[PDB]
Amino acid sequence: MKTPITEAIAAADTQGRFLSNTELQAVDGRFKRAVASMEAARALTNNAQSLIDGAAQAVYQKFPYTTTMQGSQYASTPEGKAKCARDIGYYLRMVTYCLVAGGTGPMDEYLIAGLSEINSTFDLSPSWYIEALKYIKANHGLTGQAAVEANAYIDYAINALS
Amino acid sequence: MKTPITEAIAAADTQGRFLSNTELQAVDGRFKRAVASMEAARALTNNAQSLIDGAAQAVYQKFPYTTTMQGSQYASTPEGKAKCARDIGYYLRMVTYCLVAGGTGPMDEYLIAGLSEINSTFDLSPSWYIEALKYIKANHGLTGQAAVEANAYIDYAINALS
Amino acid sequence: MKTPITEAIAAADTQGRFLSNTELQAVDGRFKRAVASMEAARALTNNAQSLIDGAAQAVYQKFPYTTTMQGSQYASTPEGKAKCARDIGYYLRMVTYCLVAGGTGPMDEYLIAGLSEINSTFDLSPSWYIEALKYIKANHGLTGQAAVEANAYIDYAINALS
Amino acid sequence: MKTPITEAIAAADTQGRFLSNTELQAVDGRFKRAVASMEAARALTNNAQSLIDGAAQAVYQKFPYTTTMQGSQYASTPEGKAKCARDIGYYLRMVTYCLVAGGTGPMDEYLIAGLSEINSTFDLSPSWYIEALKYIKANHGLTGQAAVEANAYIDYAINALS
Amino acid sequence: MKTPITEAIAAADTQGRFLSNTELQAVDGRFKRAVASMEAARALTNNAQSLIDGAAQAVYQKFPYTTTMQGSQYASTPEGKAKCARDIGYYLRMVTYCLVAGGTGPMDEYLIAGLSEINSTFDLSPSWYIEALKYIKANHGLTGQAAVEANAYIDYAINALS
Amino acid sequence: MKTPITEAIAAADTQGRFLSNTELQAVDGRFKRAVASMEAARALTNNAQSLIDGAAQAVYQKFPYTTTMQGSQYASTPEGKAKCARDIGYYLRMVTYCLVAGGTGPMDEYLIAGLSEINSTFDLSPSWYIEALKYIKANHGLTGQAAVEANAYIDYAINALS
Amino acid sequence: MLDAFAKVVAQADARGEFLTNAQFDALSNLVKEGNKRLDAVNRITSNASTIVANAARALFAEQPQLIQPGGNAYTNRRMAACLRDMEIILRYVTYAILAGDSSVLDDRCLNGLRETYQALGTPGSSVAVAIQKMKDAAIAIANDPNGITPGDCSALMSEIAGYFDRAAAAVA
Amino acid sequence: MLDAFAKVVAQADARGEFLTNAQFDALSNLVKEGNKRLDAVNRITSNASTIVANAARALFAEQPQLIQPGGNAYTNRRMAACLRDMEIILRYVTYAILAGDSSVLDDRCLNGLRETYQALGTPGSSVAVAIQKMKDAAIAIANDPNGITPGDCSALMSEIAGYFDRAAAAVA
Amino acid sequence: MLDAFAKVVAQADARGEFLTNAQFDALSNLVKEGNKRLDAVNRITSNASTIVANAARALFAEQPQLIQPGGNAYTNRRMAACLRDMEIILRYVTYAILAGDSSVLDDRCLNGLRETYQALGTPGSSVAVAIQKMKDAAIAIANDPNGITPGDCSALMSEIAGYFDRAAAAVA
Amino acid sequence: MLDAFAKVVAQADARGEFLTNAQFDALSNLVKEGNKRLDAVNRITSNASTIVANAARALFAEQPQLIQPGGNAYTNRRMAACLRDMEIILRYVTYAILAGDSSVLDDRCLNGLRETYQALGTPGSSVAVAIQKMKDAAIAIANDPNGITPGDCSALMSEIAGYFDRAAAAVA
Amino acid sequence: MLDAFAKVVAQADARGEFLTNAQFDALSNLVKEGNKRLDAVNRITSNASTIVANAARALFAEQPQLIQPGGNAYTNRRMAACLRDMEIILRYVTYAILAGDSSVLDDRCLNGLRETYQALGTPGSSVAVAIQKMKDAAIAIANDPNGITPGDCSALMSEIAGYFDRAAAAVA
Amino acid sequence: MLDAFAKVVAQADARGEFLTNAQFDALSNLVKEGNKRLDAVNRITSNASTIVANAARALFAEQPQLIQPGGNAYTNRRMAACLRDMEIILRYVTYAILAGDSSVLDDRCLNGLRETYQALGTPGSSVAVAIQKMKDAAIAIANDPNGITPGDCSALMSEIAGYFDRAAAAVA
Numbered sequence A, B, C, D, E, F: 001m002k003t004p005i006t007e008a009i010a011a012a013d014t015q016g017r018f019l020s021n022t023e024l025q026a027v028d029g030r031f032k033r034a035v036a037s038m039e040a041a042r043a044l045t046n047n048a049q050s051l052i053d054g055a056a057q058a059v060y061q062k063f064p065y066t067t068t069m070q071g072s073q074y075a076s077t078p079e080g081k082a083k084c085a086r087d088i089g090y091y092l093r094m095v096t097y098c099l100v101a102g103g104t105g106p107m108d109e110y111l112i113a114g115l116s117e118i119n120s121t122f123d124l125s126p127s128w129y130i131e132a133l134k135y136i137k138a139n140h141g142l143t144g145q146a147a148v149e150a151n152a153y154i155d156y157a158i159n160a161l162s
Numbered sequence G, H, I, J, K, L: 001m002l003d004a005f006a007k008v009v010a011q012a013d014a015r016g017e018f019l020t021n022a023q024f025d026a027l028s029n030l031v032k033e034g035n036k037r038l039d040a041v042n043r044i045t046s047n048a049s050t051i052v053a054n055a056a057r058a059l060f061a062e063q064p065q066l067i068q069p070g071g072n073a074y075t076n077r078r079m080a081a082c083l084r085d086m087e088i089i090l091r092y093v094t095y096a097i098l099a100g101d102s103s104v105l106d107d108r109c110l111n112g113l114r115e116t117y118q119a120l121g122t123p124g125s126s127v128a129v130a131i132q133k134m135k136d137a138a139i140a141i142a143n144d145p146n147g148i149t150p151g152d153c154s155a156l157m158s159e160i161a162g163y164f165d166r167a168a169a170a171v172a
């Protein structure tokens, strides 16, 4: 899984090297940034439910047809709405995993790999999840470098969907 | 040339990626550590001559035969002693390059690549340059994390010679 | 470009062979089927405009939000509607190219290669073009093996979108 | 084994594709041509013995030295003549296999692969088997596209011997 | 071209080595054997014409049909007989080249490479040239290690034809 | 293991060839040279102890610091002197192995492979073993081609150390 | 890779015998049924994406543990792999349908697959359920009486059912 | 690689236009001539070894300097390469005949070949002579009135002659 | 690949000289500006998809001939390649921004690219227009005064503008 | 490859759960101990050559049969391989120290190594002795109270001792 | 790969000992017999094609089931493979004859060959018969008293017989 | 790769002629001089490291700008490459000495080398000086009258001098 530390190791191992000061500096950057990262991850975790519920409505307001149009891909039945909130929670949970791990590793492995084929096969529009992510980004209530950390991983998600 | 920054770029480019927060953290570690690195590089640069002259004698005291034994590989003629101080200066200069660049890049390219073949072809003992480096390490007069930076690149040199 | 003939040649050339009766039979199958293929291609070509206009409305009826929702990806402005009918015409034109060439070659090269990245980058839903293709398939007015030829290439398009 | 069908499959599988209309046409060509192919294979099968006996003499008349000259490679002993008629039967049998399979597969695997090394190692002249094949081609008694099928596989044999 | 010397060089160069005593010994073997090799090459060269004329008749006696049967591959016309003696001379000349070069190099490059395709394309039987070589081997009039050298390269030719 | 014979085999096997006169000559060179090689190997073997003891002092005289300077790499303790004579014996023994095998094989596998890393890791100067080899070369007491054989493998050792 | 015709040839050659009248007639019938075979293949291939998706949705509805956190089809990577396997199996099944012989399916798809799944921790019994569903839909699509010359394809549908059951048996 | 049908498609798409009635009729005629085309290909391929050998023998009879010591076709290696080139050219010519378009010949065979021969010292003018002879025999074989339904293949023979002259022009 | 720090080192070593006080101070300032640099990189990368898409849409609006039948960006394959190039160029531009030196951009992206476009028939002048638009949006995003500690990044924006103009100059 | 942080993530995701307050606090402590960890890694790496050499010398002093004629470390090739293994093991141990998790060591170094040694005839019990010595020196170097801010690294030294014992256990 | 000389060296080095007078004399005799060895190798190699063919013909005469339809040497592909194996074995046997040691034969030819034949369905006992026949002819050719300096090569013929029996034992 | 013997053969075959008495005598003399040739090769190879080192030291003494900061042989990497080239050239020169023909040197070493040096910025005139020095020492070593049967090797020394001058001419 890609983190600053595994990237430092991978860099040294690829060339049969012992770690050097070149890589230790990189890890120190991870340790220093962890203070803001943890703060962001804790806050999103503590407020996850309201963010999930708020983001789901943001989608339904942007795309009203998702709650009326008939089909298993839509949130027009109680099951569909449960699938949708579930998915939103997955995205948000992955963001907190990236913050804690210090890198995109968690999202890369669990969510981004295969995303396009899942959205094509199941008739899911990337535009729905971008709206949800845009909502979380605007209403998580973080400031300073905690917001910079959160938004960096949220914008990473939006890019994978674009 | 290997630095924390080129290593961050190389990591993203190898996989056709845009930079991520994973790599930005690594570079921030470089910027934070640069304060101690510059301090070490400046001090060694300012006191380079006395360190070079002191280290050359450390060698001649450890290995008296280098100033009496006959041969072009030894410092038994005015030319040999000039070659020796020159080499010591090269090593010390490379250390300041590593400190400034934030990585082993400079020493890797200019000094370590081909070192074993030069020392074999020209009958130069690695033990002579280890002694010189040990002298510089003990008498550079640095404290705190400035000493940690200096010694890390000096011990990197000794390892390449061992 | 992939046709029954280029596939026959490619098969012999890959192994440094002269053509054999194995490949001539395959081409004879192409010549025999061409009678139905041409019939289908001519009819779609002759009625292309009404099929294009009918299919565009099928989409707008299935997805009313495409004519009201604001954004450059939608057909809510005169320009958007012109882009949409244009795209539908592209799909239909490609189908007639496959019929004439006797294979999927034309659609593979001109339309399918890169389709997912264009639809992701420009916020175009595959579901819109599947509906249009479903309309063309149901209303082209062909019977017998002419319909089998047409539908085979139309269903090939739908599969690339699914 | 190479047939029009396995060639169609092999073409789709090489590129991880589902079969397309491009390949189905090729197989339809096989099914249409099978009517003439079977007719040829049945007739050669029914008259195989007389063709084998007639072809063996054609050789012995063209190359009288094969029935007088001494050596195990020649048909100058009862055993040699039995080996020769056997070989001729092999060739003819392979032709009927190609007709039935719709391709050169059977002859490629069972007869052509390794032919040059067998004829070199055992002192067998390709000219003997070309004469036999020329006899079968002229006296099989087929007309129309049945003859075209038979001769195509017989001339395929002669080419492998030339 | 393959000789004991080029083989010695090729062995050292393949591994980026300077020549060693391992390879010098091999070349000394070439120089020592050259005395017998030259003797054989001179004698065959001096008596080449009678050997060529004697060998051509050996073939015509073994295979009388080569002087009566009609076809461009046979020696049944003045042109064919001129081609045949020419070929025999080629073989004998190549043998003297192998003796002089100390290896099979000359025959490998000028005669053996492509031999099977020339004999197949032009309807030439390897059995004709084996007989000619058998004649040269029995009637060259050499003794001792000169005969061993000559026969070794003649039997090398027969093996390439078998 | 590299000898003239294994080199001859390796040359034929690399190309799926039967041995040819090209390779037999090389082996004959080995057999002819073996007379001088054995003579050299026997003499060095018979006088090995005095050569080992004489060579060890040659080193200690050239590099007096090896018997006074403190460290496990030096011969300043009874153990160090035992390691040194042991090493010298290894070198001399390897030379007799090369003479007997007719090639550098034995020295390549048992001594040269890894030599630079052993001398670097254990602080052993190549200059010490070159002096010992120079002593053996000057005092082995061989003449004619026996000396040529011995010196060729001794100079091979010196080159690996230079 | 053999088809129905090469299979007979390979069996006849192992005997060193020409084809018999029974064999000739047996292969003429295959040809005479060729049109129906091509229809089946065209029909199943033209709806490959629906068969896969609809079978996947049904499997996860009946076995929701495959997609819950910790499930073998949880995460988009594993879900994509799972759908991929389903496409792959359906692809090589249609190969067998066209060739009239299962060899391509056995050699290129089912060989060693059971061991692959056991090493990964993928439940093969759930894969078989996925296969049985693709089968039902494939036959339902292939034997649809609409928009096609009327006739009896029952023998062909039995054969197709065999290739699916073979794949299901191979993974379980 | 294009055939006669894909060529029209690629020209129509560059215009963004559907096919015209003239184009449709132009391609229907190709189909209606397909039987004759297959015969030509079957006939030339079934005698490929004779065309090559007989053309090679004739070339060396007219240009004996190619096979005398020092000649470009002297030694069996060079002679085998020469015969090989002749087979290769005839092979890709028959490819063009079947496709109804020279693209395969241009792209896979004649592209850069003139430069290959100049670097090796092979006389391209002699290769062209070899090609012109294969042509004469190929047409003579393809247009043989024996054992074939009578009809006019003259337009087809002119096309075949074009592919040969194209190869000859490309090497000289 | 060099960054701003290794570049000085490589210039000092070519002279065989230690760093000067001027050089030390010149590199300390780079460090002291590091935060702003990382922001610029984070900001442009976090909106890479918008910069690309919006620049592509604008280019085709101003130059509709690129997407009409026969255009260099007509067909989805060519359109995808075109968008790809835009992502690639933006990617290596952000590499240069982080390193403080254009070497990575020159060596891995702009080297020989002008010749690539001329051989393909791609109008380099249109690529430059695409690049100039990504630039305007990138700077506009990077220098947005919202949600960031106030300060002067003008020197940094001038540098970023340089890397874009360098890419535009290289392709035209 | 996992580090201490990704390990928690991978365990939380298998449950489909957000991190708990206990987990957050557990990972904050790792960060707060990061300085000590980097020191340990810098210290052991800066003396890697001494640890290896000095451990090798001690092993051969206690087990002289490894270097006598016929021994597994006799000849320079085998001796170089032996020293190499020691460097390799120490290298991947320092990898584990930095990551705070043994996965890199298990997957890239200790996996299948016991079988490698058994096939070659290398005594694994002697390798373990070599490992135990590198450990003692590594800890002695890492926990040296000189030239470093005073503090308690005992928990860290216990962890490092674990990675060494793990390697020793894996080879014996 | 070892020869007779390197074999002694490798045994002496495992003891760490110089060669003994017995060993020196043992190797001088090998040299003094070198001429006879080269003759044997030259003689068997110069008739390799006859040994193979004549042994193949005899095997199939005694075991006609190998070449009847269904036999392991039926079809030209299998027959060519069979003759190939015979050439390969004879080739590596002559390698052993020249080296004076079987290592090349064991390592490059007989290692794992028995398992190869069992997986393919090739009767190894029939291969051994093929080998025993090549042996008889090879010895008969090598020990022919004609056209060679008279002398006793019996010890050498016993050695050659050993390499053949070794190959026969390895395949059966 | 040709040696002195194959060169004559290749010239005779281009004429299609047997060797002449003059050629036979010309090649017998080469053989009769073989001992001296082997000595030269053994002597130069046994002192290859001294020739290289001593020539390198002399070059840098006469041209100190090559090793000063900015010089083409400054830094250990470039110095190692420079010494490497010197070993490579000496290696292929000794190849030519043994073969009696320069082809191996021309084809494998001097072909395109002048262009390699111009692209890198390496002064070829300085390489030639390095080559001329290896020559002087090589001849001095090869023609040393000590410890060798007395005789005249002057013709051989002239040839060796030619191979060196050829390499020097090729790089300058």
Ligand SMILES: *[C@@H](C)[C@H]1/C(=C/c2[nH]c(/C=C3N=C(/C=C4\NC(=O)C(CC)=C4C)C(C)=C\3CCC(=O)O)c(CCC(=O)O)c2C)NC(=O)[C@@H]1C
Pocket (backbone or CB within 6 Å): A033, A144, A145, A148, B021, B024, B025, B028, I032, I033, I034, I035, I036, I037, I038, I039, I040, I042, I142, I143, I144, I145, I146, I148, I149, I150, I151, I152, I153
């Ligand atoms: C110009 C681009 C705009 C601007 C930038 C700006 N930032 C600061 C201060 C900070 N910027 C960061 C950002 C990072 N540090 C890192 O290590 C990383 C990678 C993970 C990032 C993204 C940080 C941490 C700081 C310090 C804390 C803070 O918020 O201040 C300044 C002030 C000068 C300085 O260097 O501190 C400026 C000017 N501000 C603008 O108005 C420009 C539009």
